């Protein structure tokens, strides 16, 4: 946490304090597809010639 | 129009070669399906010829040497040189169709269906020459005159080998015509039938003719139905 402190306001000694950071963030642990039941398949050769 | 028509049949001995055809019209063998299902009545099958051109590895561990044929795509046709025809091959073949993936007819599947095919050609490799067919014309009798019905025909007796096709007034008499197929004899003779059932009335009156074919002796036979006249 010190790091980003220290390279935040672009100097090695920072005066005694408390500075704003970043948020803590949470990477997704699953990428789920919900879709419908369908199986049917769309006549396109009908569509076309 | 869009049919498979079988060509190209003729006599084959033990010793030589003959070029059979598949004939495709309306649709072009260029980018089309041909299989050829081999069938022999009774039994299973088996599909062999493997000709999908372009000429790499694809061959069946059955027929190796044997089974040589080209294709020619511009002219809508496939040409069969069937070389070494074994004497053990009595099978009327028929080309066929398929269905592979990529047409609409599948965006999500396999394929596989045969769908349309031929008629198929009668080609025998006997070691024996060609025999004639003989044509009896079975008269109808007492009982098939007052029976309303009167039953008549020619019987094709004793020709080696197949095959003997039956027509009747050349095409003008369809109506009752019942084709009998031929008997194995003994002595490997065959002996097929072919009753029409008609009116007893037009018996005499109506000129019955029974065109008796045999394409590998090249015999074709007009034979006259009569009635028992002493």
């Known amino acids: 946490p010190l790091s980003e402190t220290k390279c935040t306001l672009k100097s090695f000694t920072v005066e005694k304090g408390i500075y704003q950071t970043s948020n803590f963030r949470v990477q997704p642990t699953e990428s789920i597809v919900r879709f419908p039941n369908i199986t049917n398949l769309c006549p396109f050769g009908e569509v076309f010639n | 129009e869009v049919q498979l028509v079988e060509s190209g049949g003729g006599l084959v001995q033990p010793g030589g070669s003959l070029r059979l055809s598949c004939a495709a019209s309306?649709?072009?063998?260029?980018?089309?399906?041909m299989s050829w299902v081999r069938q022999a009545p009774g039994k299973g099958l088996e599909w062999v010829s493997a000709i999908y051109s372009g000429d790499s590895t694809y061959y069946a561990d059955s027929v190796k040497g044997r089974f040589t044929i080209s294709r020619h795509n511009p002219k809508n046709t496939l040409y069969l040189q069937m070389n070494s025809l074994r004497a053990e091959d009595t099978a009327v073949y028929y080309c066929?169709?398929?269905?592979?993936?990529?047409?609409?007819?599948?965006?999500?599947?396999?394929?596989?269906?045969?769908?349309?095919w031929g008629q198929g050609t009668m080609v025998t490799v006997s070691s024996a020459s060609t025999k004639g067919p003989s044509v009896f014309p079975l008269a109808p009798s007492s009982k098939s005159t007052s029976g309303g019905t009167a039953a008549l025909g020619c019987l094709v007796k004793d020709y080696f080998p197949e095959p003997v096709t039956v027509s009747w007034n050349s095409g003008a008499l369809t109506s009752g015509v019942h084709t009998f197929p031929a008997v194995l004899q003994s002595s490997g003779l065959y002996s097929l039938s072919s009753v029409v059932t008609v009116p007893s009335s037009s018996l005499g009156t109506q000129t019955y003719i029974c065109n008796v074919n045999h394409k590998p002796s090249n015999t074709k036979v007009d034979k006259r139905v009569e009635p028992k006249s002493c």
């Open positions: 309306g649709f072009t063998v260029s980018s089309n399906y």
């Open positions: 066929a169709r398929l269905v592979g993936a990529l047409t609409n007819i599948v965006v999500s599947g396999d394929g596989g269906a045969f769908d349309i």
